Paper text:
In this report we describe the structure determination of the core domain of replication initiator protein of cryptic plasmid pSTK1 (25,26) from Geobacillus stearothermophilus (RepSTK1 residues 1–269 (27), hereafter referred to as RepSTK1). RepSTK1 formed crystals belonging to space-group P212121 with four molecules per asymmetric unit, arranged as two dimers. The structure was determined to a resolution of 2.3 Å by MIRAS phasing using mercury chloride and potassium chloroplatinate derivatives. Each subunit is crescent shaped, with a concave inner surface formed by a 10-stranded, antiparallel β-sheet the outer surface of which is decorated with eight α-helices. The subunits interact via interfaces at either end of the crescent to form a ring where the diameter of the central cavity is 20 Å. The model of RepSTK1, crystallized in the absence of divalent metal ions, contains a water molecule in the metal binding site. The interior cavity of the catalytic domains is also positively charged, when calculated with a divalent metal ion modelled into the active site. The DNA binding residues of RepSTK1 have not been identified, but two extended loops protrude from the surface of the protein (the top of the protein as shown in Figures 2A and 5C) replacing the separate DBD found in the staphylococcal proteins. The differing quaternary structures of the catalytic domains of the Rep proteins may represent functionally relevant conformations, since the active site lies on the inner surface of the β-sheet and the diameter of the central cavity of RepSTK1 would severely hinder access of the dsDNA substrate. Enabling RepSTK1 to undergo such a conformational change would require disruption of one of the interfaces stabilising the ring, with the smaller of the two interfaces needing significantly less energy to disrupt.
In Gram-positive organisms, the smaller plasmids often replicate via a rolling circle mechanism, a process mediated by a multi-functional replication initiation protein (Rep) encoded on that plasmid. The Rep proteins possess two related catalytic activities, a type-I topoisomerase-like cleavage activity in which they form a nick in the (+) strand at the origin of replication to initiate DNA synthesis, and a religation activity to join the ends of the parental strand that is displaced during replication. Despite low overall sequence identity, there is a high degree of structural conservation between the catalytic domains of the Rep proteins from these Geobacillus stearothermophilus and Staphylococcus aureus plasmids. Structure-based sequence alignment reveals the conserved residues are almost exclusively located in the β-strands containing the Rep_trans motifs, and it is likely the crescent-shaped catalytic domain represents the canonical fold for the Rep_trans protein family.
Author numbering:
A (entry chain D): -1 to 266
B (entry chain B): 0 to 267
The structure:
Amino acid sequence: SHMSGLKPCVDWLQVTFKTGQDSVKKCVEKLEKVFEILGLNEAEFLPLKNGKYGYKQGVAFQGNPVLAVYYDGADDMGIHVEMTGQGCRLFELHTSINWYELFYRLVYEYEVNITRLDVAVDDFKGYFKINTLVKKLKDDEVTSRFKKARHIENIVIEGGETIGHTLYFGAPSSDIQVRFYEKNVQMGMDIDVWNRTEIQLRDDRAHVVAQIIADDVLPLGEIVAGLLRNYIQFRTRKATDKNKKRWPLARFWLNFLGDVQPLRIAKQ
Amino acid sequence: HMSGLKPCVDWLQVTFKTGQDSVKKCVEKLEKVFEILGLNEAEFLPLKNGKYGYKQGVAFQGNPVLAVYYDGADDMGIHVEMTGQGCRLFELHTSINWYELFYRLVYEYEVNITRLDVAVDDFKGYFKINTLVKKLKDDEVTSRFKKARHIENIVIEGGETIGHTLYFGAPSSDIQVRFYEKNVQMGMDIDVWNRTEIQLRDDRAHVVAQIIADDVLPLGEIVAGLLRNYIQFRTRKATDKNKKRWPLARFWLNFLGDVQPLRIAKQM
């Protein structure tokens, strides 16, 4: 492909429109309103076979469950929107608004719980190999606010080659998880370099980042880079000192974080 | 102090369909479901939330490991979910047994069995998971699967790798096999505890259910047969380069031979 550089994006979104709150912001109660808030044409939503998460019914954009709106749950469950990775791309292709506008509305105009937001960086240049990260972890060259990482690798049974590496930091249910993987391998695509770094945020953490996107002032890159820097330090072993806390941050990592900083969600 | 090999049923999910023109009886009431399970109606309490598109649920002694979901969209029926712990809980309190439950589900009532897991606990230690990993990477394995996933945990302070796990097949596909160190997974102070699990979905699950219900073959023979057929750990033979003519490894032949006669007892 002609894919190059680093590119940031929003990669998951789940929000719930609450009902019957005495709130300063507007409560949403109708599906039609939800479609409008998204900047998407009502006519394009179709019913789904099944609900999900305790909601008895759902609709989806062009019938596609990657971009779904669930409703008719137990008392006070409101309306729940779910936009997977693919759904965020689908949103982008058809919405009449901008990410910042969507988040403006969710943050400032309506009464919503933002339950999950994932932000990502695609790396088409190749600042590092995931396996280098794995190695650094196993060689005791990493510090972090997390206690453990999960390492997943695929093994092709005929031949025995290890082809794709994934690292997960934090529990999936907790309010911040970081993931690194080879997205070329994951997607079955024939591109030499495509690494993905993802931060998954839940509840309050997700709201704050939504607000920052809404206000549109700080580049998204700065939030991603600030969070990665703070949560995880890949370091270079220094023979002189045994205190890991005084090893310098590794060069590939400083370069990655420094080139991530200025990145902005594309506007149009 | 535990020893040997022990089989068990380790997950079950079924849906009672409504309004089928069927030779078998349609179930339409929760009370009937409790009776089919041989469990006391009085012991079921409401859950906070539904799940999977069902708006409401109850659970045995309030405990969601053994749950019954209902009030979903038209034609969704009633869904029972029994996790690992729920299968143990079922065993302790039911007035019937596994054979009778599967008899009822396969021959008496109109049900979709969506998932069934069967497991073997190994307290002797017929192999180490890491040996299996190594054999895979050394090109000493053939299988009907194309890939395995190897999952390991890495402790960030120190870099120690703990908790090796191997998965064969995708989690959505209709047969998956898993091997892991269950002593490590459960945080328990037992020297050797390996677990082998076969997860089956839809028709694959029904077939094994039907085998249990017919009560002609030991369960051990189905587990051992599936393992043998789907995965072959082999010993490298210097004379021949063709993997297909390497003999099966000894530990593996010993494991499968001792799994064969294992049974699900008639008393829980």
